[PDB]
Chains A and B, each alone.
Chain A
């Protein structure tokens, strides 16, 4: 069931990969057949092509990752993993390529959040087709080191922290009253006395009304009025019967309505996860069994390979070993004849050197060497020439040449053909369990035994050659020692804190960090936990922004234009939550979670984040840490306040954290409140501790030194709450990339409301106007949303939700209580995003004309 379905899914994924490879080969061959002229392909067509490629590769990624998640053939699994990492790499490269050509509207947007919605709808897929949840195999793969790291972390936490549950984000409530118990008692007493007096005076009013009615009835009876009493009961019974029959009719009407709801399909039939027979439970059990299956096959296949290599070496070890001994003896005899027993070999290694020259190989390599070294010959004559500036067309063609087959393209394609040739043509009917085949085991084990034999024979024939050379008493021509490895005092970039951690092994530094609370076990989280919608109408927002800017260009009043341009260009749609999830996943999970992607992608390990408090930065940090099983070290001034009071301790802690990250791979460093360390010095006297600002120099030198190796899968996290505090130039030049979390929109905010309300286990009303509350709540961050939702519902309130349906006014009070972000803050966030990201740089780029000249500049020398 699972094996066959996953075989078909891999089949479809390889079909998609072959479709993309043929598609992209199409431009190269078309160019080859039409290389004569230039190509006037607008950025629109290239954008469509790369976006379709990106979406198809996303589908391939989804299918392949799920297959490896539930692919049980370890030989098949290894191929799936390598192909998946190669596809992930070319996917990141495709995303970058789409980023570069984001020149829509006749502009130069180098946006990390390209808009593919128009293609998405044109291609008949919903936005969720772009989802790229972070693969979960980053943990199982080489899980030993990370599991040991987590074991040590928990041991240290018990050593000092005394707690094991992952710390949750404790948000201090500003609703605390600094009053003595007497004040609260008096307030409660005033409340109770007021309400009791109200009740008693209401009773007095009721008694007055009763007296008035008694007087009126007495006056009426004084008139001798007779009122029939028998008919009153009959009238009451008739009215009650009519109302009861109407109620029966109505209840039956809504019963039929709900029957139509369930049958014709109005209300979804939600499956409770807790029930024993939930379909999700069956799927989870099957996945658990299947995964244990992949590990069982892995272990038994490793044991089979070990035993097979043992038996192979035992049976065919001595024989071919002696044969290659004889070959080495013959080569030594030929060597002696060539030197006439005067100069003999020292190592049989050159035996390979004389047999590396493959006929066809010698041809290919001789041609390549001649062609390469030919270019070196011409580098001697023309030197007096000038150093002329680069031509515009030269670089335009160099960076506009349609890229050919990337090497990773070659890797992925060739893997596809080899899998098709070997495993597709493999008859699994006899091997119904899809376990390893002995043939592949032998084929891939032969290298191990052969190389073991080669090493043993190399040693043995080394002794043989020594003895043979001594036989003729051939004095060993003194082996001139290679220049003594002077360990020069190279000025390796010295970082703060080295003095206090010299001679200490990593475990002691880890214990110190744990005792210092810098490192904490953050609550596990998933990237798909970031409830977010795709930029469905982001492109239309961009079109409207461009049109409004063009209309502004037509304006005549200089003052009006200056005022309009001073305020941030709100017309630009902010990066989508789906786009932000994609960017974070691609930049962190694959590099942090994959070594091959780290090598094959841009070597960046510095991310900055700008957003309102609780807007989801902690959610992203938790999701990444849980998915990649990475230690999170928060050096935020708030998380370290009250413990560091000198520069030496900060330097030592930074050095220890960096060393842990380098050696405790994977590792991640998070730091909030970055403004106090890189804020505006000229500003007023901030209440924050000045000591935090000193972190700039140590981190500055670290960044300028390239401390973390580009392939090393460790990243530094910078997320702030108020972007305007930090220096924009330093932010631009000090972090590899920056991300701004947009305020929730109508659709995304409403969906977040629905997700939280379902999370709290509150019933869903049919006539509830979600978008009304969405409008009422505009201007609040995600953290404020969560805080208000938690505040509104309590234990008894949640237990009483059935009796009282959710009411609009319930959210009226809390919304004002939680922190509120004014439109000015959003405008400043957008301005900082445009400036630090450099979008304003492009804006200024595409407005200055080229008419202005470079004339006289020498007269004004006085």
Chain B
């Protein structure tokens, strides 16, 4: 019983760890997508700097 209690507790802890990993993964993905859109707009504005 002690074995199973702590195995369950550590499995839940690792589940929370994977959850935090995933949340940080969406954080980084959103950061990178924001930069992607930003640089796309910056290139379209370079198509105005080229008018200059």
Contacts and interface: CB of A to CB of B under 8 A. Distances in A.
State if A and B touch, Cβ cutoff 8 Å.
yes
Interface stretch (A193-201, A265-273, A499-507, A563-571): A265-273
B9 A268 contact: yes
Interface string B1-31: 0111111011001001001101101110010
Contacts of B23: 1-2, 286
Nearest to B25: A1
B3 A264 contact: yes
Chain A contact surface mostly: helix
Given A1-B19, A4-B26, A282-B20, A268 B33 contact: no
Contacts of A264: 3, 6
A559 to B, nearest CB: 49
A645 interface: no
Contacts of A261: 2, 6
B6 to A, nearest CB: 3
Contacts of A43: none
Given A1-B19, A1-B22, A279-B16, A269 B30 contact: no
Nearest to B19: A1
Interface in A234-271: 261-262, 264-269
Interface range for B: 10 to 19
A107 to B, nearest CB: 37
A432 interface: yes
Interface in A417-453: 432
Interface in A298-318: none
A265 B3 contact: yes
Contacts of A268: 5-6, 9
Contacts of B5: 265, 268
Chain B contact surface mostly: helix
A266 B9 contact: no
B38 to A, nearest CB: 14
Given A279-B16, A282-B20, A432-B33, A265 B10 contact: yes
Given A267-B2, A269-B6, A279 B26 contact: no
A522 B3 CA distance: 42
A519 to B, nearest CB: 43
Given A268-B9, A432-B33, A1 B26 contact: yes
Contacts of B27: 1
A4 B22 CA distance: 10
A279 B13 contact: yes
A432 B31 CA distance: 12
Contacts of B10: 265, 269
A266 B20 contact: no
A269 B13 CA distance: 10
A267 B16 CA distance: 19
Nearest to A433: B30
B33 to A, nearest CB: 7
Contacts of B26: 1, 4
B11 to A, nearest CB: 10
Contacts of A432: 30, 33
Nearest to B11: A265
Given A1-B22, A1-B26, A266 B6 contact: yes
A267 B22 contact: no
Contacts of B3: 264-266
Contacts of B33: 432
Contacts of A267: 2, 6
A261 B7 CA distance: 11
A199 to B, nearest CB: 47
A273 to B, nearest CB: 14
Residue of A2, A261, A262, A279 with most partner-chain B CB within 10 A: A279
Nearest to A286: B23
23 contacts: A1-B19, A1-B26, A1-B27, A4-B26, A261-B6, A264-B3, A265-B2, A265-B4, A265-B5, A265-B7, A265-B10, A266-B3, A267-B2, A268-B5, A268-B6, A268-B9, A269-B9, A269-B10, A269-B13, A279-B13, A279-B16, A282-B20, A432-B33
Given A4-B26, A268-B5, A269-B6, 7 more contacts: A1-B19, A265-B9, A266-B3, A267-B2, A267-B6, A279-B13, A282-B20
Interface of B: 2-7, 9-10, 13, 16, 19-20, 22-23, 25-27, 30, 33
Interface of A: 1-2, 4, 261-262, 264-269, 279, 282, 286, 432
